[PDB]
């Protein structure tokens, strides 16, 4: 609610994902997307910011070795 | 980004200024829409809103006035209340749309946004006309509701830069409207000292009629209305300061309402003063002194007493109004003890006088 | 919604029922207007029943309410106007004006009597307060009502 956060950004795309993050990572997600927007001197945050921020925070490679299944 | 877009967009905007004075609306709307897509980026801040202001002017003038186009400018004001690195032009920016809001007739939003530059005063240090424009709007705003004291604050704020009072031809009504509007306000301590401060001014002498009005409304017992209207109802159309007087007379609704307000003011003054002096009073004497029917007297004082303004307890059966008759069985000898203290102090003080005076006669 | 309706049915509490109705509105929030409108009407009438009309006027002033426009809100706002002015003629006038919905909800008809009685007592205390001993005919004329019922109400009040 504190960020301008554009108008067209979609949040349902991120809540529906599965990754059981903690509650102190949501804050870091939003903070990081904001800083990403500040870097390029644009003062409204866009969707690509959220995408790259999410990928930056999570960092889970695969851990899904397949031939067991 | 070292001007790599600022120079480009500035050149394109000056091109737009050159074409718009000759080009038709069909192409110029498309040009503005195309040039607006780099507004959202930030980083340029200025030069993006000027296009917006020009667009607003164009879309007003094509219809010679519109309300939706006014809505096209409400959003970005606070956005660039801090975008531009300049004081004056943003002030002009965020007061210009005020008149648009007034044309739309939205008082609440207008006064919400008006809070922005109240503390950014002294914006006139090089442009008095801008300060005058700022003060000319609230006089219109509060003229809608009933507040009758803030407008005096505004007019007393037109006591500014002597580019205002060095032009007596309008300065007259400048200092007349303040003394006419102070009277309309209901009695209170703030008015009690405002009438005092507005009075006691040297050049105020230059007009005798309004000086007389203030003198009458400062003292005690007042008039029966009839004589006052016969003695001041005609000066409201002669002279060179009657334009606020016209405002009090001209508009039918406005004039009628303000007559009603002055009427209520005088009858209220009568009530307060007689309650200050009298103690107990009959019905018919009240009706006779107020020059109106008994029923109207009762109805008029009813909302007064329910307002916790006058401490009265009318008893209808015998019709004896009874101001200032609370009574107490513990206060009595409080008063008694007070008188005792004063008497002891006074007898003390007399003896010093005795001694020092006998000193200058009987030393030898 | 159903929980709030049952809660207010037997007339035990209003704070909890209003709470339920607000969170149910958050249930209808931004996904279903046809039920959000009736949620707002229930919210406003419940808040009126707590003798909090200025609360209603401020609350419908909110941006969320500004989005959910309507015409029933005019009816509720005028009823609040009548309540904070303490007038029985005003409330009767508002009832005549918006009889199409006020006397349309089955639930409203139950609570109308109690709200009427409360308004009557408040109006009478305002009218008779400003002074002392008085003939009953004047107060009867002022309230615009017959005699006998008026002094019966005065007796019940003083008792």
From Swiss-Prot, chain A:
The modification N6-acetyllysine is found at residues 48, 52. It is found in: Cytoplasm; Nucleus. Component of the 19S proteasome regulatory particle complex. The 26S proteasome consists of a 20S core particle (CP) and two 19S regulatory subunits (RP). The regulatory particle is made of a lid composed of 9 subunits, a base containing 6 ATPases including PSMC4 and few additional components. Interacts with NR1I3. Interacts with PAAF1. Interacts with TRIM5. Interacts with ZFAND1. Belongs to the AAA ATPase family. Component of the 26S proteasome, a multiprotein complex involved in the ATP-dependent degradation of ubiquitinated proteins. This complex plays a key role in the maintenance of protein homeostasis by removing misfolded or damaged proteins, which could impair cellular functions, and by removing proteins whose functions are no longer required. Therefore, the proteasome participates in numerous cellular processes, including cell cycle progression, apoptosis, or DNA damage repair. This is 26S proteasome regulatory subunit 6B. It comes from Homo sapiens. The gene is PSMC4. The chain holds residues 350 to 418 of 418 of the full protein.
Swiss-Prot record, chain B:
One of its GO terms (cellular component) is extracellular exosome. Component of the 26S proteasome, a multiprotein complex involved in the ATP-dependent degradation of ubiquitinated proteins. This complex plays a key role in the maintenance of protein homeostasis by removing misfolded or damaged proteins, which could impair cellular functions, and by removing proteins whose functions are no longer required. Therefore, the proteasome participates in numerous cellular processes, including cell cycle progression, apoptosis, or DNA damage repair. It comes from the Eukaryota. The chain holds residues 93 to 456 of 456 of the full protein. Component of the 19S proteasome regulatory particle complex. The 26S proteasome consists of a 20S core particle (CP) and two 19S regulatory subunits (RP). The regulatory particle is made of a lid composed of 9 subunits including PSMD12, a base containing 6 ATPases and few additional components. Interacts with ERCC6. GO terms for biological process: proteasome-mediated ubiquitin-dependent protein catabolic process. The gene is PSMD12. Belongs to the proteasome subunit p55 family. This is 26S proteasome non-ATPase regulatory subunit 12.
Curated annotation (Swiss-Prot), chain C:
It is found in: Nucleus; Cytoplasm, Cytosol. Component of the 26S proteasome, a multiprotein complex involved in the ATP-dependent degradation of ubiquitinated proteins. This complex plays a key role in the maintenance of protein homeostasis by removing misfolded or damaged proteins, which could impair cellular functions, and by removing proteins whose functions are no longer required. Therefore, the proteasome participates in numerous cellular processes, including cell cycle progression, apoptosis, or DNA damage repair. In the complex, PSMD11 is required for proteasome assembly. Highly expressed in embryonic stem cells (ESCs). Expression decreases as ESCs differentiate. This is 26S proteasome non-ATPase regulatory subunit 11. Residues 13-159 form the PCI domain. GO terms for cellular component: cytosol; extracellular region; ficolin-1-rich granule lumen; membrane; nucleoplasm; nucleus; proteasome accessory complex; proteasome complex. One of its GO terms (molecular function) is structural molecule activity. The gene is PSMD11. Induction: By FOXO4; expression in embryonic stem cells (ESCs) is mediated by FOXO4. Its main location: nucleus. Phosphorylated by AMPK. There is a cross-link at residue 63 (Glycyl lysine isopeptide (Lys-Gly) (interchain with G-Cter in SUMO2)). Belongs to the proteasome subunit S9 family. Component of the 19S proteasome regulatory particle complex. The 26S proteasome consists of a 20S core particle (CP) and two 19S regulatory subunits (RP). The regulatory particle is made of a lid composed of 9 subunits including PSMD11, a base containing 6 ATPases and few additional components. One of its GO terms (biological process) is proteasome assembly.
């Amino acid at each position: 609610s504190k960020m301008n956060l554009s108008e067209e950004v979609d949040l349902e795309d991120y809540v529906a994902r599965p990754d059981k993050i903690s509650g102190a990572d949501i804050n870091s997600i939003c903070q990081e997307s904001g800083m990403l927007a500040v870097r390029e001197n644009r003062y409204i945050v866009l969707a690509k910011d959220f995408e790259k921020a999410y990928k930056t925070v999570i960092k889970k490679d695969e851990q899904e070795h397949e031939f067991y299944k | 980004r070292r001007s790599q877009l600022k120079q480009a967009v500035a050149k394109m905007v000056q091109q737009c200024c050159t074409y718009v004075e000759e080009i038709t609306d069909l192409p110029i709307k498309l040009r503005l829409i195309d040039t607006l897509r780099m507004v959202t980026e930030g980083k340029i801040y200025v030069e993006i809103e000027r296009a917006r202001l020009t667009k607003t002017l164009a879309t007003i003038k094509e219809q010679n006035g519109d309300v939706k186009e006014a809505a096209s400018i409400l959003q970005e004001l606070q956005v660039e209340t801090y975008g531009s690195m300049e004081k004056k032009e943003r002030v002009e920016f965020i007061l210009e749309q005020m008149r648009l809001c007034l044309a739309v007739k939205d008082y609440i939003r207008t006064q919400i946004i008006s809070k922005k530059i109240n503390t950014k005063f002294f914006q006139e240090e090089n442009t008095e006309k801008l300060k005058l424009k700022y003060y000319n709007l609230m006089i219109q705003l509060d003229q809608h509701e009933g507040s009758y004291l803030s407008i005096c604050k505004h007019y007393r704020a037109i006591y500014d830069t002597p580019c205002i009072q060095a032009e007596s031809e309008k300065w007259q009504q400048a200092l007349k409207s303040v003394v006419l509007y102070v009277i309309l306000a209901p009695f209170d301590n703030e008015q009690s000292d405002l009438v005092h401060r507005i009075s006691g001014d040297k050049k105020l002498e230059e007009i005798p009629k309004y000086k007389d009005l203030l003198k009458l409304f400062t003292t005690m017992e007042l008039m029966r209305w009839s004589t006052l209207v016969e003695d001041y109802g005609m000066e409201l159309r002669k002279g060179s300061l009657e334009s606020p007087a016209t405002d009090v007379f001209g508009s039918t609704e406005e004039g009628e309402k303000r007559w009603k307000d002055l009427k209520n003011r005088v009858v209220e003054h009568n009530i307060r003063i007689m309650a200050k002096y009298y103690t107990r009073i009959t019905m018919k004497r009240m009706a006779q002194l107020l020059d109106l029917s008994v029923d109207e007297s009762e109805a008029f004082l009813s909302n007064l007493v329910v307002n916790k303004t006058i401490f009265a307890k009318v008893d209808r059966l015998a019709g004896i109004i009874n101001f200032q008759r609370p009574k107490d069985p513990n206060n009595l000898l409080n008063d008694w003890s007070q008188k005792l203290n004063s008497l002891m102090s006074l007898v003390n003080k007399t003896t010093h006088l005795i001694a020092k005076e006998e000193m200058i006669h009987n030393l030898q | 919604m159903q929980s709030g309706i049952i809660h207010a049915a037997e007339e035990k509490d209003w704070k909890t029922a209003y709470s339920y109705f607000y969170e149910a509105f958050e249930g209808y929030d931004s996904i279903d207007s046809p039920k959000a409108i009736t949620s707002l009407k229930y919210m406003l009438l419940c808040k009126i029943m707590l003798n909090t009309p200025e609360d209603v006027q401020a609350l419908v002033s909110g941006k969320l309410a500004l989005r959910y426009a309507g015409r029933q809100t005019e009816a509720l706002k005028c009823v609040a106007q009548a309540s904070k002015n303490r007038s029985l003629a005003d409330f009767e006038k508002a009832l005549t004006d918006y009889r199409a919905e006020l006397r349309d909800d089955p639930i409203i008809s139950t609570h109308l009597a109690k709200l009427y009685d409360n308004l009557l007592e408040q109006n009478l205390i305002r009218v008779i307060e400003p002074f002392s001993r008085v003939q009953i005919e004047h107060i009867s004329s002022l309230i615009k009502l017959s005699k006998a019922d008026v002094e019966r109400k005065l007796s019940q009040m003083i008792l």
